[model samples]
Target chain A: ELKTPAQKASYGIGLNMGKSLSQEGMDDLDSKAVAKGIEDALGKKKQQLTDEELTEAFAFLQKRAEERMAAIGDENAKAGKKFLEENGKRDGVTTTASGLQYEIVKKADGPQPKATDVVTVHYEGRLTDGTVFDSSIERGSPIDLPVSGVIPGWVEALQLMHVGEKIKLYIPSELAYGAQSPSPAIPANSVLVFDMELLGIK
Target chain B: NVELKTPAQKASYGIGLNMGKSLSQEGMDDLDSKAVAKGIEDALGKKKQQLTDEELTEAFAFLQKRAEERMAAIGDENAKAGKKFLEENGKRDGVTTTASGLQYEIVKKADGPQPKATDVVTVHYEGRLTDGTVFDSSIERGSPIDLPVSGVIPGWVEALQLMHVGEKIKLYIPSELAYGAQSPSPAIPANSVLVFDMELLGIK
Candidate 1:
């Protein structure tokens, strides 16, 4: 059992990585094989796999991982569409012509930023199941970027937002990463939700 | 028994949790839980059972010293290459080398207000390493970037202040003035000498 908060946090790192590796189709990985492989590569033991063989194995693993992620993405897209269909009917949920939906948590009286302007913002992004995938709020710093630098959904929504405004956005897969995953936190074709606060326009 | 309730305590805990997320993001998958726990314990001032304090301190110093030696060797090699390039390029007509070792050639000049370090300016620029590998470019993207003068690399901060609106210049920047020993992205390697073609479009 983990004792201190630091220990628990350290354990969490391993757990999360283990989960990611499993998702990447490495569930049946053997500890003994890994140990031997490490030793062999480090020249501490006799070579088990040649350089070409290792490269071939890695390529195959990468291809399988992509296929698995795509399969997961297909299922997530179905769930996302169903959720958005119901959520769209909720009060204060505004749907734009681009099929992007947003709810204004707080309206700002400050100036709005143009697509070419750089803006600072605090944001938290989540998967449909409420898993916190990314957050600048937790990182204790606002990110600065041009309005048009992000995904298509963000570019459209941020243009409508002004400094000091807080908004929740539900972005469709097409406006996000369609058929391609950006990171393990975000699956391919996964619809994303973001709670964003516009800090300033630089 | 100790109870953790203060805002500082909570924030510190949050920092540790976020560190885990960042590590996972860096592709350090399949981490050994026991090794991680031991690392946490050791970092928090708990002495290891197997190694003496003197041995641990010595080991750490040796590792750090070796790393610094490797970095210095790379830095020296890059400095030599950059000097060779500059020595040949500096003799060309219309090229100027300042006392600070910044080299530039005036491609175009127009009368306008020169920017201060604190002022915001809009510019179109393309950056490349010594080997002519393009790392970043606002010109390629077809969008001008509006950036605070001092927010960029040291070389840029120095050169932008010397440039006026509607001016274009080619700058050859030393690694120390750019990313130094750190590679900002995959395209830009450590201790790399950089080149930039910059056009100051407007001052905001």
Candidate 2:
């Protein structure tokens, strides 16, 4: 991609590592640029600005960046919840203590599958962005499983179902993968959804 | 074919019960072959409830031929030994042949009949070789695998679709229907046979 003037400036400034800038050093550069811009605009209005006023303006811009980051996070979460509710078509979603939301579209077949009870099932799992992570349907064989082996969410959900039933499960960060991000695709603290079919119980 | 002029003389030899204690490598090969032969005979004889006489003969012939080819394909002696062990074990387990010539046994039986392919099922299984070595196991991995009848390996897809809910079957998969000559692990050599004890826990 071609670089814009601001990007070029940032790249040039980044090259001067040890001798050039600390966090405060970069802030100073930002302050000087703002001071110059303010002075240019003030020339038309004929207003005089003091050193203290320039300092306040720099602080205001820094706070604005922080505020934008927080607001965007809030907005994304709100949108995620609304979209999930409209599309998930189940009554299992709930807000957790840590502010992460969860929804269980499918409940477990029994109270919980024990480590020894062999279970046969069909399942389709996808990411929040609608990327399918894995599917038993693709494998062509009904995966026969004993309850003890699977993701934590699966263990919890399977235990709640009985033979010949299906359910959709939504796992929030706390109940699912937490702060530890898996490489390649899943980011840190992702809520996962699974459409599960419980086919057999032995 | 011509008739023998004078009925060529043949020597009869028999081993004592304790002879195996002092047997040599050559002797061991002979004994292994003998054991396999006897197992085949016993299997055929015990088919009163499972197969007709003609079917039993044909099944044994197929198994023996398959076992021979498996041994020939494996260059490594140890791997050959493992396959021989599997063949012998399959005999002991009393394998039942499908119409397609695939053989299977039931380690666990459901109270009812076999399931169909379209029925969804819950099951756990471990795949292993003849030497009791586990190559792949769904139980140890703790993840329940599920799929439709039409979705799996041709043998399993066909086999499970033929089974019913709660049925457990031990399938002795020929190499052609399995991984074939490719080795997925150090223990699994080329042309190795796979034996799986699959349980159909239930069906939806």
Candidate 3:
């Protein structure tokens, strides 16, 4: 009631601008420096910092982040082999020809899924150290997807599994993602684990 | 949980969140939020815009133009090979191209009732890539498959309406008529030109 149209718009734009800034990468940077740059640019003039100084720091930050991520990638690949070598030999773990190992949790005698079939299943995938990297479990829902469309190991294990079977999968780095990270939660070269259940095939 | 009461109050907050992400991606970390706030307050305070209309337009276009150009750089080689194959297939005398970029041949023509796009169609067909690699078929299964005329790819959406019961046709579907850029699975690649030898059996 108190704000005029221009006042309302001004409030909204600044509100929007700040919220947007908070969400972006979420890092440490000079706020005033940024604002001053914006102030100069929108003001349509030369900025306080020279172009050489500004862009140099920009590329420097980018390179630093990549090097840091690459370190994590290498460190995790070593950890993957160390942990997986020990885990694969446990009782009830059956390693297949392609080195995909699975421990049967619940067995069912229903018809096995073909590579071409679209099946519904619930899955919770995680890193080797029990980190829930990605999941359908927390959602309390089953997803419908083609058997042939998933990762190479998922394709192998699903073909090996029958409907109504629950199996714990231990996928090697070679089978899951080799030296690559799909998301922030999954580090590069991390071995993968999944609690997968097959419900129905269509 | 309850501060911003009205729709406008909430809408204003949501607008800021989306706008912030857009600016962030456009400039990466190069953009500053404070100068934006400064720009916001100055202009909102009814102070004259620091930048002229000309400078603003140029700056504005730079952000948007970069986004579209970046999308073009991740080109798939599968799409290029698909284009080459289609050009060769189109030049052959037996095939004809439709206005919608669908290519087909009159394999076996019959005089029977043609179905509308909404109607279900019974078909015995085999699908493949340009190399005659058959990926799927109902003919091999000893029965015809039934599906909605409009429910399949855009090529089949048009192709079925052009067919009659007892008619068999050879379809050469471009990626646009089929699945473009996105491969449904490894069996079918991205931007593939699909080939199908199909016969329409009945309408339901």
Candidate 4:
């Protein structure tokens, strides 16, 4: 109730920018470097690095981060491989040539879609720890997409099953988003499991 | 916990805490609390200020205007580059520019059925900005997408209708026919012109 307009604007900008940076996985940022960079940009201090040097520094930092992320992904893959080794021996589980494992929960006597045909399906994807990453059933709507439009595992599994069939698939990291993490919830080199039910083929 | 006996005190504390939270979130962890207190004191008229309220407001306004101008300059540069590229590219053999400013070149033609606005299509596509940065590519991902002919950007909807199944084409879309004024990703900035290499897989 007693603040000036300048303080309000400054605080608002600071907060918004901080939130954005943190969301981009930059929570461990160097505050001193940020302050100095701002000071240099504002002409309060002499520039320490040329534009090319700054770009190189940024690239080096990104490479280091990616390396660290890839190491973690390798560890996760190891754990997932161990998990699947034991899980594959379970009853009714079938392994594919691409290392995709699936179990038929319900086999329907309906038409199977071609690789190019569009199909509607309800699916729930989960991590190895049973954490749900995505769910069309929870969203109350099935998704319609071409058979070849999904991840490698889904594409293979979808074409193998008939309409109205429910299948549980255990997809290796290679069949999913391999070294790249698409979201914070889904990490790199992480194996995925999906409960998929083909609703229809178009 | 600090107890605030009065409602005014509680409200003031709440605003201060929210401001602090915002500052922390914005990656500004180095702000001096003492400097803030001094500014707060000046704002409350408890001490002599270095600048009057009018001057402070004007300074903020000027800074805001400068930022807006910088952003507008980038948009202008992109638009200029797009115009130059199209003018030169449109002169190339087999490259055609439509009345609506959409440009395209057929890479491969097929005799299969052409999809209508209502029919869904399967296609592989790679989209890039004028700077040659690939913003999105289903081809790289090894996953083709299916969408109704009318469900995509205006440039895509118009260009897809001109192609038949199994046909491949390249499109140069103006910003107005794409995401104009709003950037979908950092690679694709506002007022950016888009280029896409598209392969029509099937029509259903």
For every candidate, give the share of true A-B contacts it also has.
0.03, 0.00, 0.06, 0.00
Candidate 4 local lDDT, B1-204, one digit each (tens):
233223322332333343443333233333333334334434333345545556556755655655566667767777888888988989999999999899999999888887899999999999987767676898866799998887899999999888999999999999989998777554466788899999999987
Candidate 3, DockQ to 2 decimals? 0.03
* DockQ-derived CAPRI band for the predicted complex in model 4: incorrect
TM-score computed on alpha carbons, candidate 4: 0.45
Per-model C-alpha lDDT, please?
0.69, 0.51, 0.68, 0.72
Give candidate 4's whole-model lDDT.
0.72
For candidate 2, lDDT tens digit of each residue in A1-202?
1023222222222222212322212222222222222223223222133323444554654575556545644554565566555654545555433433344544443544566788998887676678777788877777887777776677766766667667766665456565454533544555666777778876
Identify the runs in model 2 with alpha carbons over 4 angstroms from their true place: A1-202, B1-87, B99-101, B111-113, B184-188
lDDT string for model 2 (B1-204, tens) is 111111110000011111221221111212221222122223333322222335435544444554455455443554566457555655764677666546787666656655575665676787886546566787766776775665666778777876667778887776667666555544454566667888877665
Candidate 2 residue-wise lDDT at B107: 65
Query: What does TM-score give for chain A of every model?
Result: 0.71, 0.47, 0.73, 0.75
Worst 10 residues of 3 chain A by lDDT: A1-10
Q: What is the Cα-based lDDT of residue A124 in candidate 3?
A: 95
lDDT of 4 by residue, A1-202 (tens): 2154445445334344444544443334432344334433333233344333454555554565667677778899898898788879888999999999999999998998898899999999999989999999889999998987888889999989998999999999989898788777888788899999999997
Point to the candidate with the largest lDDT.
Answer: 4
State residue A25's C-alpha deviation in candidate 4, in Å.
Answer: 4.8
Question: Backbone clash tally for model 2?
Answer: 45
Model 3 Cα shift for residue A77 (angstroms): 2.4
Better of 1 and 4 by DockQ: 1
Worst 10 residues of 4 chain A by lDDT: A36-45
